[PDB]
Each structure stands twice: as structure tokens, then as C-alpha cells.
Structure 1
């Protein structure tokens, strides 16, 4: 097995939070996920990065530009902030997976192509993403790996899996986010298997010669059997999604109970599923 296992552990990934989640799933994390905005300096990330790297994991950062849309970023309005982040990440030196401008084929983020301001187009998005990558490269931050992302579904006008793809020269990994909402959402959500959630986006990304990360996935309990969903998800990943190199759960219970331990059955299924994956002994 090469498949790496990751999580957002429900809170910022302090040493204690990482340990708690590892105790729960019964396995060391390969990847730990954290979310920041474009007001966050790397000095704030620093203590969390140290916890993740000390643990023997890679940090995946989703870097959310609430502060700057794709026009602002492509035009250079954020460049001082970008430059400092690049400099700080270069100096830190460890491998970091960075996911800027994510889910841009939805309509809920102000940088997304589907967003109703109509400011973001394929062209502004591509220019923005390339501009970020260029600044990081100019500052030597080759330890930062670039993660392109799509939502499992295209939501909003003008959205597509690949129209905003910035090119192989600017991308190290592609990625998908997707959730089985079960029957939990009033807008009429339905139970969907992992394959139902992810297949379409995977088919699209599989046409690009980059490895694929399932950067966020989880299932609700309501409307079906979440334990079976988990078992089937990992089996699908192994058998039918062989370009996927990492699976990163979204473990949280603020609204929908996405947690791996939303019930005893789900937890047992999760532990059993990841236990099929080869043990990777870690040492620094």
C-alpha cells in the first residue's frame, strides 16, 4: 500500500489534537489538514506545523483568500503577503502541501468561478494561481507542493472541473472534496455512496498526469449505513481510484456529525478499513 491517510481532526492540529485522533483511529496520520485565510501569517501556523512534522506527518494547508478575489490576486494586490508567506515557508523547509483558491467550481467562496459577484473567470483564476506559484518559486520555496482542487460537483454558473486548471507546470497534485450528506440537508440531499460522490470529478482529473488527493471526504449517519459506506469507500479507493495517493477525512461534529466515531459501528468500520493499508514505520 502506498495510500496515505490524513485528517482534519476537528480542531487546529495541536500535538494533543493529533494524538487524540490517532488514538481514536488506531493509526498514525500521514497527513494533517489545517485551514487558514489570507490574513494568517506563517508565524501563527508555525507551532502547528511543528506539531505535525514532529509527529512524522505532512501538513496540508487550505489557504482561503476571503481577503482577495482572483482579480485582486492576479493584479498583484496581495503580493507582499504572498511573498512573505513564501519566504517563511522556504525557511521552514519541510514539505508542505498548499491548497490555495479551493473549490472554485462551486458558488460559495468569493474567489470561485460560480460566485455571484461574477468577478472570477477561468482566466482570472488561472492567472491568480500561476502568480502565486511564480512568487513561491522566485523565493525558493520548492518544498511547497501545489494542490489544485475541485468540489465533487460543479455548482453555479460557469463552473467545470478543468476550465480553471492552471496547467501541469503549476500543479503537483490535483484533489477532490466531497461529502455524503445522507438525507440531512433541507434542500433535499440524498444518500450517495463514495463512488456516486466522487466518480465524475475523478474521471475528469484522471485525464491529467498528476497524482490525486481526496482532500476532504466524510459521510453522515442519516439516510443509510455509514459503516458500510466507509468500508465501501476505502475498497473503492483501492480498486477503482488508483490514481488517488491520499485520503483525508473531515472529522468534525459542529453541524452534521462527520466524525469517524459518529457511532460505534462507523468507528469500527473506519479502523478496519485503514488497517488493510500497509504499516509505514516512521523515524526522523
Structure 2
């Protein structure tokens, strides 16, 4: 069965996880959290314990604001990486780790499309492989590696697979994508789940790895979010057969992505999962 996940809009304490399960009316199979590259495992541990105590898998998006691909490739973050690997091995439990995500965009300082041009496919791949090498050298085979793309290539030099580090370094591929509706002054439009995800999925479906929808959500404005949710999950089950997990992004942020942005959205979400 499709694994159901979320970023719940806050750090996943025991009570945040339980509250989201009451909200969506179902267990969370996967709990998503975001951390940077100046956060040690000791800070993660009480969250990880809440996730595992609930019978869920923790997925961490591990964001190197503090080191770009050149820094990482060159070994300048290795002390930090090594401690994380040691600590995660000692912890022992199955963790899905998603480092250097959305690198086919232009908004992160490790991304290929980032305006300084410092990150290339070569430096990205070398960085990703270097991280995985350190984890394996430290015995952290409990850590599963998640490659990621944004649904669209944004910025110069970006592509779905140019930065792919190889099947020997990846356990899961993944896609992030949003229906922005008409909410953005950059001229956004309502897009169905297919309109958002199909192109990236076709590219990743060429790789013999399972796929996670690591982040998705819909706006309320410009269409019927309840129907979008119903149709999204139908589409995942019907036509995105390599997808093994769907992880909503539940936060009132750029727009109201939450599953409870309206009562009707919530009801549709509860039924869809």
C-alpha cells in the first residue's frame, strides 16, 4: 500500500505527530523534518524517538545552507558529516535522508541553477557520493538515500538527471511539486497533480528505483482543492505506479498548503488517504 507521510508544519514532537494523525484520521507512515548542516544528531534524537515510538519512518531533508557542493566535495564538511554518520549508525533505526534537494531549481545555494554558478553536475555528484561514502565507512547502512528533483527545472543548467549520482548511491528517487493556483504575482495558474508531476515522473521512471512524492500540496485559490486532493491520490494509485509514498507539505506558508486550509479540503484528504 501507498505510504502516507507529512511535514506537519512544525518539528515532529510526539504531540505534533499525534495531532496530525487526529487531523488526517490515519497513522502517518512517514514523518518528515527539515534540518540544516549545523544541527547534530543530538538535536534530532528526541524527534526521531517520537517518530519511531509511533511506528513511523523519519525522513530528514538535510539542507546544507552552511556548505555548498564545492565545500562538500573538497571535504570541508567532513567532520560534521562523519559525526552525523556515527550518530545515525549508533541510533540504528531506518532513516530516509534527503540531502541537497531540489538541485534542479535556482533557490538553494547548493543547487545547479543557483545564481553564482558554483554548483555543477560534477560538483553535485561528487558531493552526494562523498556524503554516502562517509556514511558507509561508518557502517550507517540503516540510512536510505533519497535523490530529489523539483517538478520543474528552474534556472540555467538545470535538468532532471544531470545531477543524478548513480544507482549505487541512491535508494529512492523523489519529486517535489505544488499546485500554486492563482496565488502568485509571478502569474501562477491552477495545475492538476498530473500537470505538476508528469514530466518529472517520466524522467525518473527511466531509473530502476522506487519513487517518493517527497513534498506536495495544493492552494485553495483558483480551483477546488478538495477535488484536487481526491484526484491526486487517485492519480498516484492509478498511473504513478512506481510511487511508493506520498508526503504532503502541511504548512501555511507561501500559500495555505495545509490539509485543513478548508473543511472541504480536510474531508477530501481524510477520504483520499
**TM-score (norm. length: structure 1):** 0.96
- SS of the residue aligned with 1:136? helix
Residue 102 of structure 1 and its aligned partner are, at CA, apart by: 0.2
Residue 10 of structure 1 and its aligned partner are, at CA, apart by: 1.0
Gaps of 5+ in 1: 275-284
For 1:221-274, what per-residue CA distance to the aligned partner results, in whole angstroms no more than 9, with x for missing partners? 000000000000000000100000000000011341101011111011001111
Residue 47 of structure 1 and its aligned partner are, at CA, apart by: 0.2
Gaps of 5+ in 2: none
**What is the CA–CA distance in structure 2 between the aligned matches of 1:216 and 1:246, rounded to whole Å?**
10
- SS of the residue aligned with 1:141? coil
For 1:91-147, what per-residue CA distance to the aligned partner results, in whole angstroms no more than 9, with x for missing partners? 000000000000000000000000011000000000000000000000000000000
**What is the CA–CA distance in structure 2 between the aligned matches of 1:271 and 1:34, rounded to whole Å?**
22
Residue 51 of structure 1 and its aligned partner are, at CA, apart by: 0.3
Note if 1:113 corresponds to 2:112.
yes
**What is the CA–CA distance in structure 2 between the aligned matches of 1:88 and 1:100, rounded to whole Å?**
17
**What is the CA–CA distance in structure 2 between the aligned matches of 1:78 and 1:218, rounded to whole Å?**
33
Residue 197 of structure 1 and its aligned partner are, at CA, apart by: 0.2
Aligned partner of 1:282 in structure 2 is none
**What is the CA–CA distance in structure 2 between the aligned matches of 1:262 and 1:80, rounded to whole Å?**
42
List structure 1 runs of 4+ shifted beyond 2 angstroms: none
- SS of the residue aligned with 1:113? coil
**What is the CA–CA distance in structure 1 between the aligned matches of 2:107 and 2:33, rounded to whole Å?**
19
For 1:208-229, what per-residue CA distance to the aligned partner results, in whole angstroms no more than 9, with x for missing partners? 0000000000000000000000
Note if 1:243 corresponds to 2:242.
yes
**What is the CA–CA distance in structure 2 between the aligned matches of 1:211 and 1:94, rounded to whole Å?**
20
**What is the CA–CA distance in structure 2 between the aligned matches of 1:236 and 1:219, rounded to whole Å?**
15
Note if 1:261 corresponds to 2:266.
no
For 1:27-78, what per-residue CA distance to the aligned partner results, in whole angstroms no more than 9, with x for missing partners? 0000000000000000000000000000000000000000100000000000
**What is the CA–CA distance in structure 1 between the aligned matches of 2:238 and 2:2, rounded to whole Å?**
12
**What is the CA–CA distance in structure 2 between the aligned matches of 1:269 and 1:257, rounded to whole Å?**
16
**What is the CA–CA distance in structure 1 between the aligned matches of 2:106 and 2:210, rounded to whole Å?**
26
- SS of the residue aligned with 1:124? helix
Root-mean-square deviation (CA, aligned residues, Å) is 0.5
Aligned partner of 2:129 in structure 1 is 130
Q: How many equivalent pairs are there? A: 273
Note if 1:163 corresponds to 2:186.
no
**TM-score (norm. length: structure 2):** 1.00
**What is the CA–CA distance in structure 1 between the aligned matches of 2:82 and 2:23, rounded to whole Å?**
38
Residue 19 of structure 1 and its aligned partner are, at CA, apart by: 0.7
- SS of the residue aligned with 1:218? strand
- SS of the residue aligned with 1:12? coil
Residue 181 of structure 1 and its aligned partner are, at CA, apart by: 0.2
